Amino acid sequence: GAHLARRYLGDASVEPDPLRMPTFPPDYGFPERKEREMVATQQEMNDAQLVLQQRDYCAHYLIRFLKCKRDSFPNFLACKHERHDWDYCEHLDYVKRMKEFERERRLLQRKKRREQREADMA
Amino acid sequence: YLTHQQKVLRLYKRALRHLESWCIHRDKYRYFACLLRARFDEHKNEKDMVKATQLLREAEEEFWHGQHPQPYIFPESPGGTSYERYECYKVPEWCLDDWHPSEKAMYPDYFAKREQWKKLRRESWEREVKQLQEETPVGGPRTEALPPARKQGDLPPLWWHIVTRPRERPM
Amino acid sequence: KRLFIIKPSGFY
Amino acid sequence: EPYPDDGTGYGDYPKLPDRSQQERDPWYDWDHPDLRLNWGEPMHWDLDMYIRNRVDTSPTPV
Amino acid sequence: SKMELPDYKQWKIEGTPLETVQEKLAARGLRDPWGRNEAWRYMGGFANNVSFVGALLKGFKWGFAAFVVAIGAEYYLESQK
Amino acid sequence: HAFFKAMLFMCSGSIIHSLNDEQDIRKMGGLFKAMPFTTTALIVGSLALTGMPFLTGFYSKDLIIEAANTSYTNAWALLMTLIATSFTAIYSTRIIFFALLGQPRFPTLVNINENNPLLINSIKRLLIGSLFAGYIISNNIPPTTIPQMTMPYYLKTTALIVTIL
Amino acid sequence: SGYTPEEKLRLQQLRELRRRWLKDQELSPREPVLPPQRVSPVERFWNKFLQDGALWKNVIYKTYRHSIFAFTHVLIPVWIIHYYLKYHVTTKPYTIVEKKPRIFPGDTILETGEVIPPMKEFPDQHH
Amino acid sequence: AGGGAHIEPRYRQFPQLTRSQVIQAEFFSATMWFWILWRFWHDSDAVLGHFPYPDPSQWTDEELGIPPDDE
Amino acid sequence: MNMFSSLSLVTLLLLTMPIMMMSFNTYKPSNYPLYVKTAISYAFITSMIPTMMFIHSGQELIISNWHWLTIQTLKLSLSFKMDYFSMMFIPVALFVTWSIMEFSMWYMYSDPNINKFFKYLLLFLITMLILVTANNLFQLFIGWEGVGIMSFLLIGWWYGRADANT
Amino acid sequence: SFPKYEASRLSSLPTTLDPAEYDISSETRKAQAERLAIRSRLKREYQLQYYDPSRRGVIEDPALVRWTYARSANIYPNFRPNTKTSLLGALFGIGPLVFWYYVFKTDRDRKEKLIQEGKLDRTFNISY
Amino acid sequence: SDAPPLTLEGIKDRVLYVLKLYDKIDPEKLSVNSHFMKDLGLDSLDQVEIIMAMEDEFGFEIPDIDAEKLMCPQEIVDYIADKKDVYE
Ligand SMILES: CCCCCCCCCCCCCCCCCC(=O)OC[C@H](COP(=O)([O-])OCC(O)COP(=O)([O-])OC[C@@H](COC(=O)CCCCCCCCCCCCCCCCC)OC(=O)CCCCCCCCCCCCCCCCC)OC(=O)CCCCCCCCCCCCCCCCC
Ligand SMILES: CCCCCCCCCCCCCCCCCC(=O)OC[C@H](COP(=O)([O-])OCC[N+](C)(C)C)OC(=O)CCCCCCCCCCCCCCCCC
Ligand SMILES: C[C@H](CCC(=O)O)[C@H]1CC[C@H]2[C@@H]3[C@H](O)C[C@@H]4C[C@H](O)CC[C@]4(C)[C@H]3C[C@H](O)[C@]12C
């Protein structure tokens, strides 16, 4: 990616650190934020035997897709819509992570930007 | 050893074989095979032996620098894929003397005729020894070449293990 | 052409 | 040419060239085609290390 | 059996890349005696062999013909619904 | 990999047997027309190994290359993997060019016969597998990970660009 | 650069002996003289039956041999394996351990007729 | 090796090709290309991309919660 | 489970039958390559039944049928793991091994020891199925080392060749 | 132009690049044919027995009986306890034994200290 | 190995067939007993290529010790027939 060219071959203080992110508290902006809404419950995922890395906020669609696949057998070409639903939810989840990287990316600009004024001036 | 004539011919054969490996395509090989022949022609009839050696000795250095790292080798030649592939099927003839009579009963004609060869080998041996005991110098043989048969009805001395040797595709 | 195959004795 | 008399036990066994049996001529009619040896020929002290299944010393292109 | 070999007079380097090699050798005073030995490799069924792009496209003509029918049929059946 | 790789050796064996135990591609050539069925299987196998889309080898190799790119991974190990994908096309093309195309380089008397029903059926079944096996397996096995289906255009198609080049 | 007259003569004499030896390696029509074999009556029925390579006849042979194989190599073994697993291997604790079957929201359990509540409403995604 | 058809080897000539040999090879080559085109027609997002990839720059500082510099 | 277990073991047992028949000589020669090829074919169809039962509902199980040895607090029993990486590899290996055995009937037709060749190809397949289905390391070590030995005996098939032994 | 070939104990000098091959003199010629006399003299003694039709057994090879004797029974009587053999036998014979002793005594001393202190994980270790 | 066995006539036909395609040999005077050096005026450098063409014809190498000893197409047939166990 282009970010790798910046954190290594250039200034590294303004680039996010993937292992340490996030740094700023979640409420720096956003006068009010909403907690993520987990549709599935622990017993539902537990009884569906989802792999622990599959028990994310998209799990509710995954549960429905697996149920359709079992019922649609032997038709493996079926449950095409259910798969896309789960894929799209994982696509939205990935974008939120991309937004989180940008939020940390820009908030680190603030420190490098609201610190020359308080250093150059005095 | 190898006389200067033999060493030049060997280098020419090696040079063309390795060259054939680089070229691959026949038409391209037929081009550089002629050019390489010309280089062996500009000095075809050199007179000074010392100069001839210096030409041969320099060709080898150019051959070593230019040889293909992975030259083509015929399948059954030393270092080839099929080399010694059938040496496990090559059984000697003396193993047939240990056969049970029941097995020999399956090939009555083959073993009847095999008995004739054994008689032929057994009758001609004492003559073969003499044929070599008289043509050999006083000290001993100075070369590995054997002489042919001189009298009608005699067999070439030391013929059994070159005549009865197993076939190249025994099975 | 159905040659004779020389093999060691297999009877024993 | 025997080995140097250094007291390691070589005695008078000949010091033959340290060449593998892969360097021998493969077209000569050896008495032992696989070993590339002749009956009566003196054997290298390390012959069993130089058989064609083991250490090779043939010239390399590089 | 007794394989009957073809007449040996048909093997000519004419009209083959072997001739082009003989032209370039004629510009240096050298000749190629063995050209006719390699001639059979450029004549008969071994002449005008396919190219690499033509090898990877083997069966494309019939494959494409079957493909156009399939999608055309798919449109028709889906026309009903 | 089991389907199309086993096919390549069997196609290699057909060529070797025809040319009287000649395993060197320098003494092959002009077999595209002489061995049409062995040629078809070799081409199909060389397209699954290289990653031709939708054949058997596409449903595993390209997911790997996509997941290797979008991972917190060693950078140099990623570059070597991509270069190795370029080399896969080069040596697969090497077999096709030096064994199928061009003019013959094998001896004058050769029996190029590949009509034995055992040879056709064995290669034929793997030929079917090296076309549809990846599609069938991928659509039947249950998911066990969160596949990465969102990424920059130049990371999704890196396998194709590398292979085509 | 060629054979000396002595060498040529020896090669010819070796060649004439070698060819005759190779000739003697040919088998006569009688050979091999197999001893009598007790031919099974069943195989006799098929020797005559397969006298003419009829397409329909060999199919019956094809079905016959496959049917026998499916009885001596699939049916008999599975009977033994099932008996072994049914009454010897599954009668001991923790021998065959089956991963519990997956339960999804809205499934009915056969053992007790229980019903799993459906999941909460999915708000909306559309796309 | 053993079975099939007995083809006479030809000396310095093109080998003899049977009929079913050439039909089957052409059919499977065709079957390959039909499969690739049919799969490409229906599933082209498996090789070019399924979902759009956002451009982080175009995201507004309001939705990322980046409070203004002064405050 | 009654069918999943029985048909998952019949596959392994089916492949060992040709080995057993070639020990007590309860078979006829010159059909052995065909006999072994047919065993793989039936082993492939039977192995597809447990695979389908997995594809249907994701059914897996572990079979610990024979108690072999108990070293104090370590109990070693012959255990077979029929799971994701056993219901998908066995069908693939048998399908590929089916073709290679058929191709071998033609490629190795003139080999005098074609019967031993098909016994070694079969023994390797058994040691690979032992390795793939192993539920404990010791049993995994049996097929892990067995495949190496059968590789050794097949690489040096033409044992008269020095380069084959090396 | 053409870099010279540099040999090694595992890469012998090619016969086509060895000066002694192209420097053919009178003494070398006599030596080469003088060797071939021995090769033929031995080759004849072997052949008179190999081709013998009444022979059944093993042709004893005096060269093979000299090689095994030279490698087993002739070693000790031709050994002298000098500086070369004493240092080689000291560092190859005793050296490894002392080296491994300290590798294991140190390893077990360190392990025993942890076990006594109770800071070595042996939670499930009940097989020794 | 499924290939047709060689015949004495076949070896002679193919040995001469290759020489007939050698420009420096006149097909009219070419015979089984035609010595290369003393009946066709070919230098040894040309005889090496003759042998190299024979080994490319039957697909097996002829060692240089014996290649430089064959000076006649009849001898080549004997050498090839002896190294392929051809007896009729
Ligand atoms: C109490 C009532 C019951 C009575 C009890 C009485 C008990 C008394 C003892 C009776 C024992 C009977 C012995 C046989 C009698 C003679 C039969 C006969 O006529 O011979 C004809 C037989 C065939 O005739 P031929 O072709 O003319 O032979 C001449 C050639 O020279 C032949 O040379 P070749 O190159 O063709 O082959 C040589 C070698 C084979 O060549 C090789 O490949 C050597 C390398 C093979 C080993 C590589 C794999 C290593 C891994 C072992 C895997 C097994 C453990 C797996 C455990 C977990 C899964 C179960 O021979 C073999 O060993 C064949 C078997 C290979 C092992 C088979 C393993 C898989 C079998 C299936 C196991 C599952 C069974 C479940 C059944 C259901 C439960 C009951 O000739 C011979 O084989 C002569 C040698 C006989 C030796 C027998 C000993 C076999 C030992 C097996 C190999 C060692 C494996 C090491 C692991 C040991 C684990 C136990
Ligand atoms: C963990 C270490 C265990 C110690 C043992 C392993 C170390 C090597 C010492 C054992 C090898 C010597 C055995 C005697 C030789 C017997 C066989 C023989 O004669 O060879 C002839 C053969 C020659 O075969 P060839 O194919 O090379 O050439 C023969 C000639 N042709 C090809 C023309 C036919 O050589 C071998 O097969 C042996 C090669 C292996 C030896 C080298 C091992 C290298 C190990 C990897 C090093 C990098 C470390 C990687 C990480 C792994 C280590 C943790
Ligand atoms: C059915 C199968 C091949 C048939 C085919 O594909 O044409 C044939 C080929 C050789 C046969 C086997 C061998 O003849 C050895 C056994 C002979 C007896 O008929 C018992 C079953 C036996 C084990 C046979 C089962 C089956 O009929 C076999 C395996």
Ligand SMILES: *C(=O)CCCCCCCCCCCCC
């Ligand atoms: C970045 O995501 C890491 C990608 C590492 C694999 C190389 C892919 C090519 C990247 C080119 C940089 C493009 C920047 C616009």
